[PDB]
Each structure stands twice: as structure tokens, then as C-alpha cells.
């Protein structure tokens, strides 16, 4: 009938039918299994809770993300997540609707081949497609030229596109993302003292980072202000009931993006990677890419990240080139919106991967879909 | 500790 | 005059002057207060007994450890302990000798700052330094490269160091240590019947674990052998004359280190944390980290812990790499030996935190000497 | 006393006294600086490691090549390599021996002038000469007529010479070299999955390319054979102990030389550039240049490169003209051997740049070394 | 991943 | 380089 887009992120699965303006169901990409004893008190139980159900009762589970750093490592968990989505969230038969998936650039061919085989054999989708997340974000933005910085939960890539001609040699991929920032917040929350070690406590730390953390325009000045007994101290109430105070940790957790050396990463910050990706293009493309810096991804929702990135790039970029950063309010679902736009296009209907093509070419057929 | 664990 | 090293552990305080090969005085970090009535029979009494005196007459006291899992909970108790050490054990005036202290990694800055303020105000040490236990253990081992696991009474941390360049991002901290093993032994001694609830009974259980407990090379095989009516049954005599028999509890109490799920802890075993910490370093670094596994701390003295850890790591590590574990016979005082070595160095004499620096920078001055 | 030849390449510094048949000391042109924290176990260290020492302990260093594409970028680092070579490798005073340098053609004059000034003022070299690498390679080959393809780590130039009369209008310089091939191997090893990001991991990738990579005689046929489950799959062992498998990536890493469009470079392959350089000379010279094709540089050591480029040139060149390629086994040190031959010539002793000439003409005197 | 990084 | 390419 109608195609459905399932953007399976590395920490948040967003799925829904093509043509909609927002995902129909958004739940964490978490598969949890009971950790404690089975216990005498049992009236109906499940050996594994998937999605929002796992996080609802996360006090008795060891949540395990099937995807991190943009790669599925537990394929049984991914099969469980896909089945849960298709049969509980969208509540539709996958054998009737084509499915469009998103994959981060610079990813193994084995992973995409395995996902294709799983969705074509376990499920019976008549057609399927795998697209790069940054291209979908650019589709959602509505423009044809620009450089997309999609910073998800597990990956942070950067694909520059000019007039619809993507340059597959200036794509820079970084492994700094929401999970690494959450781990860093867990590590540096030790300084004040409030430390969280378990996976449920890791989810609590992730919620703390989502609610309180922000990006400082000037790191040194903000650190001095915080150390000077300023008002940068917000209070968060844990589920147990005890309030905690966050001081300079608010702007130090997301400062890892612009300073990967905090967790001992040799790579450069997101601003430096974006500048290098722009500088790797042709000299006639740099001017347009400078003024069309499209931002997407969940972790690009920090307050003040756009201003800090613009200031850093303007410092790096020549003074005579205008720098503009586009940060739409729908950055969290930009990839899914672009996927929905692409899947409903009249021209895209001929670029699917039909079941006959998969049968005649085997699982190793998704290699002409490179963007 | 203050939050998490006792100490 | 001469520097003194006071390694205040979470259950065993070791103190002594720098340059010595062994601590001058080792006493439990226990502060006990009378529990029963004062009673008409009083000719000379104290309201609180510290260290060995508290354990000598523990039958009428409620022993309370001031330090546990590394953090100081009661500060008056540690003021008492430090005064008792300095004025009864070393029998020297603290105002003349610099004091070098040891703190577990990934600890709150408030604890170290308060310890600094206490030692610089209540006492008058001309200088004082705070170091990390694993770094001191590596100093004692005599090498410059290797990964240290210091499993003390309250904490079990892990600091990998290569060529004297420790990585403060691969440090894994665990809360499984001698106190948790003692509590688990108290819980599982109930199975045979012998129960121990009071603090003195907790000390008795600690002594039982010290004398009889051991780490099995294979847990399932050892459990089957014990259940098959074997000779794994030793007899311990309680202070009141009764004798008890320990069966499979000998290798079940220290198996919690390799299986934290026994007491409902989600974290992985010490072998898995050590493997992760070795691996989290650079790819060129683990070649020397695999072959330089250094252990320290009291709880690393179980018979067969080295063989079990080597087998587990070799199972986890690639088969083409040699795995060597270094377990010196002085593992109990390895941290103190390393501290004595460091404090007597000619290069270290400029790294002290002088009283003038503390006065000019306040009590929040120990953040430039992080290890 | 005697002249010394220091061929400072863009990734491999080769130095030695004139008259020898091989460089006395060959070490990577790498300056490494510490990256991790401020050292815990510290007694005697250095703030920067140069050459083989940097690569020995590269796990804790951020290696930075001072010379990129044959152009010196970090002058302090280049001074560090020069001093390290002169005072540790040859172990001679630079103020006593004349020094002969090598510089790629079509290079900025500022680079050569600054190199001359640095080595003539910081050191006290009595006489310094700068020569083109291809001319030195032709000197090493022993002939006077031929076309030299010196494909080093940073540059790939092509200087045609006839009867000792170099043609400085058919010289074609390409920026595709060993560094770009290493980067492409880093990018395309992601397909199977094994990805390397850090500079030490970049050195690992360079070692992989040196050991396993080869040039296919026919690219399409070799690709089809590799995709047909053939034996073109070698195994490499990483320093951590894991074995990796390289399939079609073996002949795809060095196929960029013949197809620069792989990394989005408009320039043609090395064979096409060589043919164009030959066709830019006089019609009476092409016959001799076709039969005297000379290879040099490290990256010309791939197995089967000579046959591949001979086939490509024979396809491009007329069928009636004999095509011969000279590939001596000493291609790695051909430039240094030619420099040693030239510096020991009796006629060349008058072509030096003495101290008096530099003093009377400042540092803009190296412009009549034009070749 | 298989070599380099975990995944 | 200064213009074109990095070096
Ligand atoms: N308002 C917010 N502020 C800060 N971080 C956020 C916010 N919303 C989401 N995130 C982070 O973004 C990550 C995932 O976002 P998203 O890109 O929508 O999912 P995915 O990464 O699966 O594509 C989460 O791990 C979360 O930490
Ligand atoms: N021989 C031994 N066998 C088993 N456990 C031991 C042994 N010696 C000490 N321990 C345990 O180690 C713990 C503390 O030892 P130690 O590391 O010396 O003190 P700290 O933890 O304060 O540094 C004690 O609680 C004790 O249970
Ligand atoms: N046996 C080999 N096989 C493949 N590549 C090689 C080999 N030896 C050297 N190389 C490559 O040649 C490059 C530089 O070699 P060389 O020409 O000796 O140094 P330079 O470029 O400084 O003159 C290195 O980056 C290396 O990758
Ligand atoms: Mg995403
Ligand atoms: Mg200790
Ligand atoms: Mg060269």
C-alpha cells in the first residue's frame, strides 16, 4: 500500500508511514532482560522487554542497546526491535508496505547486507531501501546544496553536498555522540559526588544531560564564572527522591564534542571536522557550503550549540566569507522527515529494491545505493 | 556517596 | 625532617616514615565506642577506642569504619584516627614531617579537599601530597609500564599506565572489595547455620575469610567436587571455643569478585573490568599491558587468584598474546612501599604542597596534582 | 671533511655521507609529542620524540609529519629532525661537512629559501646544495637520457631528461603519493569493517599497505576474481593480537595511482601523466624517452606496478615504439644513491653554495640550482 | 568493529 | 600550500 520509513537510530528508533510530517512512534532502541530471580510472585511474565516497556520498569533489567556507534552488534535484539516496532507500534503487516532504512556513512558492507537479508527473509517487505542519514536530513531541510552535521546517539558524521552531487571523499565520520557524552557525564559527575554505574542509572544520567546540559559560548570564561560562585547551578530530582546539584558539569559534558581530548580521543572537534570537510571540497563549492551549514541529530539540540559552532567556524573560516548555520526546531526528527519526503517522491518509486532483484542477486545487492 | 550508593 | 607516608585505607591504616621497606605500624581503621552501661565498676575509662585497642575489647563496642569504599563518611572519626596514628603509633609530631596520602581514583573532590583542610589546619604539616593507590603500587613494582589492579577493603580500581603515561580515560573503578566479600560470607554462612550479625561477629567472619577462603580455578568443577563429599571442608575455632565447618563457602565468598551478580551487582567481574581497561588504551599499548598485569591490595592475596585471573584474561585476550600476571608477595603493603619510594625521591621534593601554597590558594588547591 | 647527503623525504628521512652505496640512517620523518596526562611515574623524560623513538612509543604520542606533499609546514619540527639526524644518526658536526639536499620540482621558492636559511644559520654548514629528486634518481641509474617517475610519500613528479638536458616544461607533478594511498586504505578498510583513526593506527595502515598491497595487472578482471571467492585474501596481525583479512582492498589501495578519481581528484593516472610528459617533448626525443622509463621512490615498489604501467603506456604509445621500464631493486634509496654519486663528483665541487656567497647574497641565492 | 573500537 | 591544497 503505502511505504513506511523506519529510521533505526543508535539509541532511539523512529518509525512511521511515508508522507507524514512526524514519526508515528518514537521509543528507545533498548532491549532489556530480567536480571534478578524469577521469584514465586508470577502471573504472566516475559523473558525480554523491548522499547518503552523496558525503560518503564528498568529497575529490574539490564538494558542492552542493540546499536551503538551506528552498528548493530546483537542481531537477535535488532530482530526483536524490528518485530516489536512493526507489530506493536505501527501495527501493520511488513509484507504489505515497503520499508526505507537509514544507515550512517562509512559503515561496513557486511552490516547493511545482514540488515537487508534479515528484513527480506524474516519479514516479507515487497521493497526496501537504505539511505544515508545526512542525505535524508538535507532532503528534510528542503535545499539541494549544503553540508549536513548529523550528530546522533552513536555517530556524528558530516556529508557535504553541492547541487545534489554528494562528494564521497570529503565525508568525515566521528564517533563522538550522545552515548559518549552520557558516559563522560557519568564519569565527571563523580567530582561533586553523585555517581551512576548501572544501566538504569545510565538512563538517569542521560535524562540529566538532556534536561540540564548546555554548550557554553566560551569554555574558559564559563568555567571561570562557574568557579566564581555564580548562578550556573541547577537542581535535578532523582526518581529515588534525592535532589542533586550540577555546577560546571553542565557545560563540560557537551564540551567533549569540541574537545575530544577530554575522553582521550585523538580526533578534532566537530567544528574542526566540519571545517576540514568543507576545505576538502572544490574551491568553488566552499563559499556555498559555508553559508548552508545544515545541522541535524539529537545531540545538536544543546542550548547555544549553534552559536558556539558558528563562532568556532568563523574563527577558522576566512573573514570575507559569510557563515550561516541552519538549526531547524525539528532537528530530532529531521532524518525521519527527510526519509518520509524521499519515500513519497514519484521519482524515487523506481529506485526501490524489489524482492525479485534480491532473489536474483542475493543479499549482496545493496551496493548501488551508495550516496 | 550523596546520590547512588551510600557513602 | 623526614617525610612520612600514611596510607589510610578503608579498613586497614598503614603508616610509616619514607625510605623504609615496610610500614612501621599497621592497625585496623576502626573507631569503637562503648555500647553497654558505664556501670559502677569504673576506674579509668575512655569514651572511644581507636585501632587495635578497639578490636582488642570489641565485645563491648560498636566498631564503625570511618572509611569505606574509599570515602570518609565520619570526619571526627578520622580526625581521631589520624591523631591516634601520629601520636601513638609513629610517636612523632606531625608539624615537623610532611605527610603523603593515598586516595582512590574516581573519588569526589570534596573528600580530598576536606582531608587537605583537616591535615593543614588541625595538624601543621609543612607539606603534604595526595597520590593514587595504583600509581604507588606501580612505583613499588619497580616498573614504569603496566596495568595495576588495587583491590583494597572498600574499593577495587584499575589504572593502566604505559611508559609512565597513565590514561585517565581507561580507569575502571569497582565497588567489590573485602567488605563486600565479608558481608557475602556473613550472608552465606547462614546456609550451614553459623550466623554473624554484630560488628564483632563481622570481624570474626572477616578473619574466617582471611584464613580459609580461596579462589577456585574452575567454579563449576569446584562446586561439583564440594557437593560430592570431598575434603574441601576446613574447621575454624570461634573465640568462645565452638568449632565451625566451612564447605563450598570457601570459594563462594571470593567468587563474588569474578561474579558480581552474586550480591545483585550489575557490573562485570574483576577479570572483565581488567580486560576492558587494558583494551580501552591505544592499540599499540596493550602489547605491554597484557604482559604487565600488576596486582596489589589485601583481597588479591587469595590462594589461586593469580591463576584464575590469568586463565580468564587468556580466555578473553587473543590467543597469540602472552598473558603474564605479576603478584609480588608484598601485595598487602605494595601501595605503602610505593609511597615510601616516591616520597624519598629527589625529583618529588618539588611536588609537595607547601603550607604557603595552601594559604595563598585555600583548601581547594589539590587539583593540580591529579593522577 | 667529506660531504654528507641528507634526502629529507616527506615521511622517510634518509641521510649519509657521500660516496657510500646506501644511506647510513633511515628513520621516519615523524615528530611525536605526549598526548595523555602529565605523567604519574616520572623520573627522566622528554617533551618530544623524533624519528624511530617516536614510532617505538607511538601509543602515547600524536605523530605529526612536518613535511606534507614535499612541502615543509612545521619548521620547528623540521629543525628538530635535522638536529636529531645530524647529532644522533650520523653523529657528526654539521659545521664541518657540506650538506646536499633534495627538493621536489615545482615547489614553492619560499620553502627552499627557508630551508636554506635555517640550515645555513642554525647550523654552520660550509656549503649547501639543493637538487631535484628525479635528477638524482637519473644520476643513480647511471644513464644520461630518460624519464624519471619519482613517486615518494608526498609527491609524484615526472622530469624527462635527454642527454643531460632537462626539459623544464614537460615536468608534471602529481600530489598522489604514499600518504594519499594510506588515507584511501584507511577509508576503504571500513568495508570489511577494520577501521583505523589515530595516527598510530595510520602507521599500522601504512604497514598493512607496505606488506600486503599490490598492483593488479587488470583491475576489472582482478576485481571479478576477488569477488568470485578466490585466494586473494591475506591475513595481517595487529599489534594488539587480532588478525584481520584483506580481500579486494589489496589491489584497490594502489589503484588510486592509475585512477585518481577514487578520492575525487581530477588529475589523470601516473601512466597518463607520464605519457603526456613524453608527448610534451620534441618529436626526436620521445623514442629515447619511451625506452628509458626509470622508476624511483618508495611507492613504486608495489608488486606488478612495472608491468601494469608498461601495459598502459604501450596501449597509449604507438605500437611501433618499443616501451621499456627500468625498475632497479634499490628504488627506495635511488634518490639518495644519486645524491651520493653527484656529491662525490670532481666537477660538482665547484657548484656548492659557499658561506661567502650566502653572506654576500643573503638567503635568496638558491635560484640558480634550477634543473 | 572487528578491529579498532569495539562494535 | 597557501592557496589551493593545504600545505
Ligand atoms: N533536548 C535534548 N538535549 C540534549 N540532548 C538530546 C536532546 N534530545 C535528544 N538528545 C540526545 O540525542 C540522542 C539521540 O537523538 P536522535 O538523533 O533523535 O536519535 P538517534 O541518535 O537514534 O538518531 C540521545 O542519546 C539523547 O542523549
Ligand atoms: N591473606 C589474605 N587473604 C585474603 N584476604 C585478605 C588477606 N589479607 C588481607 N585481606 C583482606 O584485605 C582487606 C584490606 O587489606 P589491605 O589492602 O591491606 O587494606 P586496605 O584495603 O585498607 O588497603 C581486608 O579487609 C582483608 O579482608
Ligand atoms: N616495500 C614497499 N611496498 C609498498 N610501499 C612501500 C614499500 N616501501 C616503502 N613504501 C612506501 O613508500 C613511501 C615512502 O618511501 P620513500 O620513497 O623511501 O620515502 P620518501 O617518500 O620520503 O622518499 C612510504 O610511505 C611507504 O608507504
Ligand atoms: Mg540518527
Ligand atoms: Mg589500599
Ligand atoms: Mg622521496
mmCIF file with all atom_site columns, C-alpha atoms in Angstrom, chain D residues 204-273:
data_model
loop_
_atom_site.group_PDB
_atom_site.id
_atom_site.type_symbol
_atom_site.label_atom_id
_atom_site.label_alt_id
_atom_site.label_comp_id
_atom_site.label_asym_id
_atom_site.label_entity_id
_atom_site.label_seq_id
_atom_site.pdbx_PDB_ins_code
_atom_site.Cartn_x
_atom_site.Cartn_y
_atom_site.Cartn_z
_atom_site.occupancy
_atom_site.B_iso_or_equiv
_atom_site.pdbx_formal_charge
_atom_site.auth_seq_id
_atom_site.auth_comp_id
_atom_site.auth_asym_id
_atom_site.auth_atom_id
_atom_site.pdbx_PDB_model_num
ATOM 1  C CA . UNK D 1 204 ? 49.509 0.433   11.218  1.00 0.00 ? 204 UNK D CA 1
ATOM 2  C CA . UNK D 1 205 ? 47.556 1.008   7.992   1.00 0.00 ? 205 UNK D CA 1
ATOM 3  C CA . UNK D 1 206 ? 50.767 2.131   6.285   1.00 0.00 ? 206 UNK D CA 1
ATOM 4  C CA . UNK D 1 207 ? 52.448 -1.104  7.385   1.00 0.00 ? 207 UNK D CA 1
ATOM 5  C CA . UNK D 1 208 ? 49.467 -3.081  6.062   1.00 0.00 ? 208 UNK D CA 1
ATOM 6  C CA . UNK D 1 209 ? 49.755 -1.310  2.706   1.00 0.00 ? 209 UNK D CA 1
ATOM 7  C CA . UNK D 1 210 ? 53.512 -1.918  2.579   1.00 0.00 ? 210 UNK D CA 1
ATOM 8  C CA . UNK D 1 211 ? 53.200 -5.622  3.375   1.00 0.00 ? 211 UNK D CA 1
ATOM 9  C CA . UNK D 1 212 ? 50.030 -6.849  1.654   1.00 0.00 ? 212 UNK D CA 1
ATOM 10 C CA . UNK D 1 213 ? 49.017 -4.358  -1.047  1.00 0.00 ? 213 UNK D CA 1
ATOM 11 C CA . UNK D 1 214 ? 49.892 -4.929  -4.702  1.00 0.00 ? 214 UNK D CA 1
ATOM 12 C CA . UNK D 1 215 ? 49.001 -3.501  -8.113  1.00 0.00 ? 215 UNK D CA 1
ATOM 13 C CA . UNK D 1 216 ? 46.724 -5.598  -10.315 1.00 0.00 ? 216 UNK D CA 1
ATOM 14 C CA . UNK D 1 217 ? 47.642 -6.097  -13.965 1.00 0.00 ? 217 UNK D CA 1
ATOM 15 C CA . UNK D 1 218 ? 43.959 -5.821  -14.952 1.00 0.00 ? 218 UNK D CA 1
ATOM 16 C CA . UNK D 1 219 ? 41.705 -4.045  -12.470 1.00 0.00 ? 219 UNK D CA 1
ATOM 17 C CA . UNK D 1 220 ? 38.320 -5.320  -13.666 1.00 0.00 ? 220 UNK D CA 1
ATOM 18 C CA . UNK D 1 221 ? 39.461 -8.935  -14.045 1.00 0.00 ? 221 UNK D CA 1
ATOM 19 C CA . UNK D 1 222 ? 41.158 -8.900  -10.637 1.00 0.00 ? 222 UNK D CA 1
ATOM 20 C CA . UNK D 1 223 ? 38.063 -7.382  -9.016  1.00 0.00 ? 223 UNK D CA 1
ATOM 21 C CA . UNK D 1 224 ? 35.844 -10.050 -10.584 1.00 0.00 ? 224 UNK D CA 1
ATOM 22 C CA . UNK D 1 225 ? 38.245 -12.790 -9.464  1.00 0.00 ? 225 UNK D CA 1
ATOM 23 C CA . UNK D 1 226 ? 38.314 -11.437 -5.902  1.00 0.00 ? 226 UNK D CA 1
ATOM 24 C CA . UNK D 1 227 ? 34.513 -11.187 -5.837  1.00 0.00 ? 227 UNK D CA 1
ATOM 25 C CA . UNK D 1 228 ? 34.375 -14.785 -7.140  1.00 0.00 ? 228 UNK D CA 1
ATOM 26 C CA . UNK D 1 229 ? 35.738 -16.128 -3.810  1.00 0.00 ? 229 UNK D CA 1
ATOM 27 C CA . UNK D 1 230 ? 39.365 -16.555 -4.849  1.00 0.00 ? 230 UNK D CA 1
ATOM 28 C CA . UNK D 1 231 ? 42.599 -16.885 -2.863  1.00 0.00 ? 231 UNK D CA 1
ATOM 29 C CA . UNK D 1 232 ? 43.324 -13.133 -2.909  1.00 0.00 ? 232 UNK D CA 1
ATOM 30 C CA . UNK D 1 233 ? 42.816 -12.837 0.862   1.00 0.00 ? 233 UNK D CA 1
ATOM 31 C CA . UNK D 1 234 ? 45.788 -12.343 3.098   1.00 0.00 ? 234 UNK D CA 1
ATOM 32 C CA . UNK D 1 235 ? 45.856 -12.111 6.886   1.00 0.00 ? 235 UNK D CA 1
ATOM 33 C CA . UNK D 1 236 ? 47.621 -9.396  8.890   1.00 0.00 ? 236 UNK D CA 1
ATOM 34 C CA . UNK D 1 237 ? 48.203 -9.439  12.652  1.00 0.00 ? 237 UNK D CA 1
ATOM 35 C CA . UNK D 1 238 ? 47.603 -6.211  14.553  1.00 0.00 ? 238 UNK D CA 1
ATOM 36 C CA . UNK D 1 239 ? 49.881 -5.293  17.484  1.00 0.00 ? 239 UNK D CA 1
ATOM 37 C CA . UNK D 1 240 ? 47.057 -5.999  19.947  1.00 0.00 ? 240 UNK D CA 1
ATOM 38 C CA . UNK D 1 241 ? 46.924 -9.587  18.676  1.00 0.00 ? 241 UNK D CA 1
ATOM 39 C CA . UNK D 1 242 ? 43.857 -9.622  16.428  1.00 0.00 ? 242 UNK D CA 1
ATOM 40 C CA . UNK D 1 243 ? 44.123 -10.975 12.890  1.00 0.00 ? 243 UNK D CA 1
ATOM 41 C CA . UNK D 1 244 ? 42.466 -9.077  10.045  1.00 0.00 ? 244 UNK D CA 1
ATOM 42 C CA . UNK D 1 245 ? 41.680 -10.186 6.496   1.00 0.00 ? 245 UNK D CA 1
ATOM 43 C CA . UNK D 1 246 ? 42.201 -8.067  3.372   1.00 0.00 ? 246 UNK D CA 1
ATOM 44 C CA . UNK D 1 247 ? 40.284 -9.047  0.250   1.00 0.00 ? 247 UNK D CA 1
ATOM 45 C CA . UNK D 1 248 ? 39.896 -6.803  -2.787  1.00 0.00 ? 248 UNK D CA 1
ATOM 46 C CA . UNK D 1 249 ? 41.317 -3.904  -0.747  1.00 0.00 ? 249 UNK D CA 1
ATOM 47 C CA . UNK D 1 250 ? 44.807 -5.179  -1.628  1.00 0.00 ? 250 UNK D CA 1
ATOM 48 C CA . UNK D 1 251 ? 44.699 -4.007  -5.257  1.00 0.00 ? 251 UNK D CA 1
ATOM 49 C CA . UNK D 1 252 ? 42.240 -1.150  -4.631  1.00 0.00 ? 252 UNK D CA 1
ATOM 50 C CA . UNK D 1 253 ? 44.536 0.858   -2.344  1.00 0.00 ? 253 UNK D CA 1
ATOM 51 C CA . UNK D 1 254 ? 47.278 1.314   -5.007  1.00 0.00 ? 254 UNK D CA 1
ATOM 52 C CA . UNK D 1 255 ? 44.850 1.500   -7.942  1.00 0.00 ? 255 UNK D CA 1
ATOM 53 C CA . UNK D 1 256 ? 44.322 5.152   -6.993  1.00 0.00 ? 256 UNK D CA 1
ATOM 54 C CA . UNK D 1 257 ? 47.664 5.901   -8.662  1.00 0.00 ? 257 UNK D CA 1
ATOM 55 C CA . UNK D 1 258 ? 46.244 4.829   -12.035 1.00 0.00 ? 258 UNK D CA 1
ATOM 56 C CA . UNK D 1 259 ? 42.747 6.154   -11.190 1.00 0.00 ? 259 UNK D CA 1
ATOM 57 C CA . UNK D 1 260 ? 42.903 9.330   -9.074  1.00 0.00 ? 260 UNK D CA 1
ATOM 58 C CA . UNK D 1 261 ? 39.104 9.627   -9.367  1.00 0.00 ? 261 UNK D CA 1
ATOM 59 C CA . UNK D 1 262 ? 38.825 7.177   -6.451  1.00 0.00 ? 262 UNK D CA 1
ATOM 60 C CA . UNK D 1 263 ? 39.409 10.017  -3.971  1.00 0.00 ? 263 UNK D CA 1
ATOM 61 C CA . UNK D 1 264 ? 37.772 12.596  -6.225  1.00 0.00 ? 264 UNK D CA 1
ATOM 62 C CA . UNK D 1 265 ? 40.876 14.015  -7.912  1.00 0.00 ? 265 UNK D CA 1
ATOM 63 C CA . UNK D 1 266 ? 40.503 15.364  -11.447 1.00 0.00 ? 266 UNK D CA 1
ATOM 64 C CA . UNK D 1 267 ? 44.090 14.591  -12.481 1.00 0.00 ? 267 UNK D CA 1
ATOM 65 C CA . UNK D 1 268 ? 44.840 11.535  -14.598 1.00 0.00 ? 268 UNK D CA 1
ATOM 66 C CA . UNK D 1 269 ? 46.769 8.452   -13.549 1.00 0.00 ? 269 UNK D CA 1
ATOM 67 C CA . UNK D 1 270 ? 50.529 8.134   -13.340 1.00 0.00 ? 270 UNK D CA 1
ATOM 68 C CA . UNK D 1 271 ? 50.674 6.346   -16.701 1.00 0.00 ? 271 UNK D CA 1
ATOM 69 C CA . UNK D 1 272 ? 48.673 9.100   -18.408 1.00 0.00 ? 272 UNK D CA 1
ATOM 70 C CA . UNK D 1 273 ? 50.796 11.829  -16.811 1.00 0.00 ? 273 UNK D CA 1
#
